[PDB]
Symmetry: C3
Subunit: 24 residues, 3 copies
Protein backbone atom coordinates (compact mmCIF):
# COMPACT_ATOMS: atom_id res chain seq x y z
CA UNK A 1 0.00 0.00 0.00
CA UNK A 2 0.86 3.70 -0.37
CA UNK A 3 3.01 5.52 2.17
CA UNK A 4 1.68 8.54 3.99
CA UNK A 5 1.35 11.59 1.74
CA UNK A 6 2.63 14.32 4.03
CA UNK A 7 5.80 15.87 2.57
CA UNK A 8 8.06 13.32 4.23
CA UNK A 9 10.07 10.44 2.79
CA UNK A 10 9.51 6.81 3.83
CA UNK A 11 11.41 3.56 3.69
CA UNK A 12 10.06 0.04 4.05
CA UNK A 13 10.73 -1.90 7.25
CA UNK A 14 8.96 -4.69 9.10
CA UNK A 15 6.00 -4.53 6.73
CA UNK A 16 5.55 -0.81 7.41
CA UNK A 17 6.46 2.62 6.15
CA UNK A 18 8.92 4.30 8.43
CA UNK A 19 10.28 7.83 8.19
CA UNK A 20 13.62 8.06 6.44
CA UNK A 21 14.63 10.92 8.66
CA UNK A 22 14.85 8.54 11.66
CA UNK A 23 17.83 6.79 10.01
CA UNK A 24 19.56 9.94 8.84
CA UNK B 1 1.98 1.40 -5.82
CA UNK B 2 3.94 1.05 -9.07
CA UNK B 3 7.58 0.18 -9.64
CA UNK B 4 10.30 2.77 -9.11
CA UNK B 5 12.55 3.77 -12.01
CA UNK B 6 14.98 0.97 -12.95
CA UNK B 7 18.11 3.00 -13.55
CA UNK B 8 20.82 1.99 -11.06
CA UNK B 9 19.60 4.51 -8.47
CA UNK B 10 17.85 4.01 -5.11
CA UNK B 11 14.45 5.57 -4.45
CA UNK B 12 12.32 6.34 -1.42
CA UNK B 13 8.55 6.99 -1.27
CA UNK B 14 7.33 10.54 -0.69
CA UNK B 15 4.17 12.45 -1.63
CA UNK B 16 2.92 9.41 -3.66
CA UNK B 17 6.08 9.47 -5.76
CA UNK B 18 9.45 7.83 -5.98
CA UNK B 19 12.20 10.29 -5.11
CA UNK B 20 15.95 9.74 -5.29
CA UNK B 21 17.51 8.66 -2.01
CA UNK B 22 20.65 10.60 -2.89
CA UNK B 23 18.75 13.88 -2.51
CA UNK B 24 18.42 13.24 1.22
CA UNK B 25 21.95 11.95 1.77
CA UNK C 1 5.88 -6.98 -3.61
CA UNK C 2 6.76 -6.69 0.12
CA UNK C 3 10.30 -6.07 1.32
CA UNK C 4 11.94 -8.54 3.66
CA UNK C 5 10.45 -8.48 7.15
CA UNK C 6 13.61 -8.70 9.27
CA UNK C 7 14.06 -5.58 11.40
CA UNK C 8 15.94 -3.76 8.60
CA UNK C 9 14.96 -0.84 6.32
CA UNK C 10 14.88 -1.17 2.56
CA UNK C 11 14.91 1.17 -0.39
CA UNK C 12 13.83 0.42 -3.99
CA UNK C 13 16.53 0.07 -6.64
CA UNK C 14 16.78 -1.83 -9.97
CA UNK C 15 13.39 -3.53 -9.31
CA UNK C 16 14.64 -4.86 -5.98
CA UNK C 17 14.65 -4.12 -2.28
CA UNK C 18 18.11 -3.14 -1.12
CA UNK C 19 19.26 -2.40 2.46
CA UNK C 20 19.18 1.27 3.38
CA UNK C 21 22.22 0.76 5.58
CA UNK C 22 24.37 0.14 2.46
CA UNK C 23 23.93 3.81 1.49
CA UNK C 24 24.35 5.30 4.91
C1 LIG D 1 22.98 15.79 3.98
C2 LIG D 1 22.20 14.91 4.96
N1 LIG D 1 22.85 13.59 4.99
C3 LIG D 1 22.67 12.74 6.05
O1 LIG D 1 22.00 13.09 7.02
C4 LIG D 1 23.36 11.49 6.09
C5 LIG D 1 24.16 11.00 5.06
C6 LIG D 1 24.84 9.78 5.16
C7 LIG D 1 25.65 9.40 4.07
O2 LIG D 1 25.76 10.14 3.09
N2 LIG D 1 26.40 8.29 4.18
C8 LIG D 1 27.33 7.90 3.13
C9 LIG D 1 28.40 7.02 3.82
C10 LIG D 1 24.69 9.04 6.35
C11 LIG D 1 23.88 9.47 7.41
C12 LIG D 1 23.84 8.65 8.59
O3 LIG D 1 24.46 7.58 8.65
N3 LIG D 1 23.19 9.11 9.70
C13 LIG D 1 23.19 8.35 10.98
C14 LIG D 1 22.74 9.31 12.06
C15 LIG D 1 23.25 10.72 7.26
Amino acid sequence: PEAPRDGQAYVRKDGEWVLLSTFL
